[PDB]
Design a protein around this ligand. Structure first.
Ligand SMILES: CC(C)(C)OC(=O)N[C@H]1CCCCC/C=C\[C@@H]2C[C@@]2(C(=O)NS(=O)(=O)C2CC2)NC(=O)[C@@H]2C[C@@H](OC(=O)n3cc4cccc(F)c4c3)CN2C1=O
Ligand SMILES: [Zn+2]
Length: 198
């Protein structure tokens, strides 16, 4: 029993969504074999850049977003896992299963988004494929897609940001509201809920 019990690996940063220029695009920074090794050791010496990371476990891939010096993502992707870092695995600093939220100290080299104080309801969702999708805010934690899409297009983007027109963080993408496989709306953890957690 006890001597053979395994440990879950760390979450590993495997890429990023580049939002620095005039064109948004995904970049991969680590392949699958390196990901598997890094998840086991928890030691990731790769340089981190940007606000939105593409992250992976052994079994899932999703997004994580830096806001106020914390790299946030969804519990349904990360569970209670550590994140791999240059000095070894780093324990979560926030875990809230009720909000579907986790966070770790933001990695060195990352850039953080600023929480939105605009009160604007014209939002933009950034996906793991670097699609920037307009979303009208419809409540505290809900927004409608201006152009509905099959849920396939959104899968793997939980943990990504909803941004206001000025590029502030408004929320973290959590669930898709789908009818017959088509996403007409999204639900997100509002940035105020992060700010309170902090
Ligand atoms: C709530 C409502 C209205 C009934 O809708 C839905 O339950 N809908 C579904 C539609 C699923 C079809 C794919 C949709 C495409 C993209 C979805 C964004 C996404 C994703 O990309 N994940 S991932 O692939 O990156 C993945 C690798 C990280 N999330 C999901 O699938 C989540 C995961 C699962 O929810 C949860 O486990 N919890 C645990 C929670 C605890 C507290 C609060 C919560 F809300 C919680 C939500 C169901 N999910 C939905 O979205
Ligand atoms: Zn704003």
């Amino acid at each position: 029993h006890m001597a053979s019990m395994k440990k879950k690996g760390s979450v590993v940063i495997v890429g990023r969504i580049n939002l620095s220029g005039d064109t948004a695009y995904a970049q991969q920074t680590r392949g699958e074999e390196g990901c598997q090794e890094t998840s086991q050791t928890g030691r990731d010496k790769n340089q981190v850049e940007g606000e939105v990371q593409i992250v992976s476990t052994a079994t899932q891939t999703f997004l994580a977003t830096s806001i106020n010096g914390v790299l946030w993502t969804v519990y349904h992707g990360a569970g209670t896992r550590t994140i791999a870092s240059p000095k070894g695995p780093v324990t979560q600093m926030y875990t809230n299963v009720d909000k579907d939220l986790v966070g770790w100290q933001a990695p060195q080299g990352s850039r953080s988004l600023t929480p939105c104080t605009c009160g604007s309801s014209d939002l933009y969702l950034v996906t793991r494929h670097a699609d920037v999708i307009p979303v009208r805010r419809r409540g505290d934690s809900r927004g409608s897609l201006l152009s509905p899409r099959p849920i396939s297009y959104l899968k793997g983007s939980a943990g990504g940001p909803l941004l206001c027109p000025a590029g502030h963080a408004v929320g973290i993408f959590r669930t898709a509201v789908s009818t017959r496989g088509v996403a007409k709306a999204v639900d997100f953890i509002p940035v105020e809920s992060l700010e309170t957690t902090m």
